Amino acid sequence: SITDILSAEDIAAALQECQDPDTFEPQKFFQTSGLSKMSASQVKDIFRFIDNDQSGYLDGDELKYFLQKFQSDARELTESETKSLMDAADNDGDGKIGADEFQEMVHS
Ligand SMILES: [Ca+2]
Ligand SMILES: [Ca+2]
Ligand SMILES: [Ca+2]
Ligand SMILES: [Ca+2]
């Protein structure tokens, strides 16, 4: 589980940092949560928990509910914040985030 990989305190800190709407920034979240320090294998396990429909890609509602995978009572991302996530990750113009793209974004 995500819980088996990141510390609960770092997750709590990351959510605290982006409590107000339109303050989520991918890079800050990945740093505060500790995701940017994890190995490729650990980042892939997190990717699998976020990919709710097991399509192999993050898209649609999975972006809006991104924080909710870390704590089920977290807020939804705004449309602007979901666009920031896609802008940060997409490199092949398909409008979805593959596992490779996720790894590259997290480690940036
Ligand atoms: Ca490391
Ligand atoms: Ca998916
Ligand atoms: Ca909570
Ligand atoms: Ca893509």
Swiss-Prot record:
InterPro entries tied to this protein: EF-hand-dom_pair (IPR011992), EF_Hand_1_Ca_BS (IPR018247), EF_hand_dom (IPR002048), Parvalbumin (IPR008080)
Keywords for this protein: Acetylation, Calcium, Metal-binding, Repeat
Modified positions (N-acetylserine) in chain numbering: 1
Disulfide topology: none
Pfam families, alphabetized: EF-hand_7
UniProt binding sites for Ca(2+) 1: 51, 53, 55, 57, 62
A GO biological-process term: cochlea development
Tissue: Found in tumor tissues and not detected in normal tissues.
Gene3D superfamilies: EF-hand
Claim: Magnesium is one of the keywords in the record: no
Assigned GO CC terms: cuticular plate; cytoplasm; extracellular space; protein-containing complex; stereocilium; supramolecular fiber; vesicle
Entry keyword annotation includes Metal-binding: yes
GO molecular function, one term: protein-containing complex binding
Residues binding Ca(2+) 2: 90, 92, 94, 96, 101
Residue span(s) of domain EF-hand: 38-73, 77-108
UniProt similarity note: Belongs to the parvalbumin family.
Function: Has some calmodulin-like activity with respect to enzyme activation and growth regulation. Binds two calcium ions.
PANTHER family: ONCOMODULIN-2-RELATED, PARVALBUMIN ALPHA
Identification of the protein by name: Oncomodulin
Originating organism: Rattus norvegicus
Lineage, uppermost ranks: Eukaryota, Metazoa, Chordata, Craniata, Vertebrata
